[PDB]
Amino acid sequence: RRCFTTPSVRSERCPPGQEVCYTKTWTDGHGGSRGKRVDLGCAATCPTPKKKDIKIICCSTDNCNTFP
Amino acid sequence: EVQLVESGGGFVQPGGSLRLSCAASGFTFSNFDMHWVRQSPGKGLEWVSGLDHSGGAHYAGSVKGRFTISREDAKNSLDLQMNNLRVDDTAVYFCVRGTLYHYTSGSYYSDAFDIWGQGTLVTVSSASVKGPSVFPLAPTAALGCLVKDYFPEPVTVSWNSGALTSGVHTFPAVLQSSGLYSLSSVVTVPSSSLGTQTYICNVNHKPSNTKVDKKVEPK
Amino acid sequence: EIVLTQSPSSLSASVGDRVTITCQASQDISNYLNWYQQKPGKAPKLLIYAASSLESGVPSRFSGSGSGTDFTLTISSQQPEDFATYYCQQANSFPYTFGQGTKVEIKRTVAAPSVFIFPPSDEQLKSGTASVVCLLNNFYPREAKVQWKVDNALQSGNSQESVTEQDSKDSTYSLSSTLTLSKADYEKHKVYACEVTHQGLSSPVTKSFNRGE
Structure with missing residues (x-):
């Protein structure tokens, strides 16, 4: 499957087995002037947010984790 | 996993030149700021030059005019042409990727240095390749071998063809004022065995195809 | 050229101790300061960027603080794998500059040579x-x-x-x-x-x- 992956945002073939695209956001030390960080990649299981303001969005179609 | 690999290092004389190259695994140079950072015992870590994502080059003052950083687009090759080298340029050179962090407001480059190559050794010296002289350090008792006047690093020292490893101390080499290196290798053994036990140090210097076995006994 | 002053250049610590490393910049650099860890024979590893933000995979015992000129790296509980050399690095202006490093060494009892x-x-x-x-x-x-x-x-x-x-x-x-x-x-x-x-x-x-x- 294909998902948008960071750092350089492009569609990439997921490592086989991984069929879930994800979007992960969190707050940096620069969040006041730049906003939330955002990570994009593949996964075999939708990640579980550690704690705090980490929110994770998952889907299961090609290139569904578009950049906000 | 994402990696960087350096190449093109070696030994050169003052005024000489060296062309370092860097090859990336898992990403494309043109999307990132790339940097060269060198490290030496004496000045520490030093940013040498950078080539940002948009194609502009930057250089440290001690290097500008002599070093040229460049990128071969879509060829996975970041190069650093180092001309008119000096002794002061002797260091381990790291290929370093500038970080690329994404926010809801966009992309930001080189907040930090997240990917570092294994490093390549650059040594500028007027000396030529030379085999070492091996002298005994005659004698719990201590004995050793003095490995003096060789170039370049490294040498390997074993004791009794590798059978003697406990209590062995091989000190880091020191660059003498003559431009040649020197070090000692020592080992502590019981005083009762000084008369009956044989002690050999085996010194190997690959750049000069030199191999010396020296017997060390009390006087 | 911004000068970074790391203190101490060396320090001894036992497992479980609280380690504190400071870094002082010769001028204001906001929070554009990073921390690296380096083992002998190896390349430095990025640990903290933006003074306080950890990289992925860095244990929680590492933490950073400061903005302006005075910065701190703290290891809440020294572990065996943390004995290394730590560098601060500013990303505020050209050229990028590093501190001289802080070598954390293993504390033990005194032994005469x-x-x-x-x-x-x-x-x-x-x-x-x-x-x-x-x-x-x-x-x-x-x-x-x-x-x-x-x-x-x-x-x-x-x-x-x-x-x-x-x-x-x-x-x-x-x-x-x-x-x-x-x-x-x-x-x-x-x-x-x-x-x-x-x-x-x-x-x-x-x-x-x-x-x-």
Whole structure:
């Protein structure tokens, strides 16, 4: 499957087995002037947010984790 | 996993030149700021030059005019042409990727240095390749071998063809004022065995195809 | 050029201790300061960016603080894998500059050095040069004072000393001091002495020989 992956945002073939695209956001030390960080990649299981303001969005179609 | 690999290092004389190259695994140079950072015992870590994502080059003052950083687009090759080298340029050179962090407001480059190559050794010296002289350090008792006047690093020292490893101390080499290196290798053994036990140090210097076995006994 | 002053250049810590490393910038750099960890023979590893933000995979015991000129790296509980050298690095303006580093070493009890002196071999004396070696074996801490004396004359500027890394087993250091003399200067004098001052010794220790016995 294909998902948008960071750092350089492009569609990439997921490592086989991984069929879930994800979007992960969190707050940096620069969040006041730049906003939330955002990570994009593949996964075999939708990640579980550690704690705090980490929110994770998952889907299961090609290139569904578009950049906000 | 994402990696960087350096190449093109070696030994050169003052005024000489060296062309370092860097090859990336898992990403494309043109999307990132790339940097060269060198490290030496004496000045520490030093940013040498950078080539940002948009194609502009930057250089440290001690290097500008002599070093040229460049990128071969879509060829996975970041190069650093180092001309008119000096002794002061002797260091381990790291290929370093500038970080690329994404926010809801966009992309930001080189907040930090997240990917570092294994490093390549650059040594500028007027000396030529030379085999070492091996002298005994005659004698719990201590004995050793003095490995003096060789170039370049490294040498390997074993004791009794590798059978003697406990209590062995091989000190880091020191660059003498003559431009040649020197070090000692020592080992502590019981005083009762000084008369009956044989002690050999085996010194190997690959750049000069030199191999010396020296017997060390009390006087 | 922004100057970064790391303090201390070196420090000893035990497992579980709280480690504090500071970094001071010669001018304001906001929070554009990073921290790296480096093991011997290896490349530095990014640990913290933007003064306080951790990289992925970095344990929670690492933390950072500060903005402007005064910055701190804290290891809440020193672990065995944390004995390394730590560097701060500013990303505020060109050129990128690093601190001199803070080498975290393994704390242990004081152990006095075992001292040996070695006269030059007759083989080397054929070359016109004489080397005299003083060995300091398995001691802690690193700080030691080695003084060379030739017929009671204090030597200065003609000796170099080399130090091993902290031993993987007992965490001790070893040091060699090498006195370099010409063959003519060596055979003019008779008594060669190495006096060692170390915290683990009751009083300084001298080792000596007489040329030709």
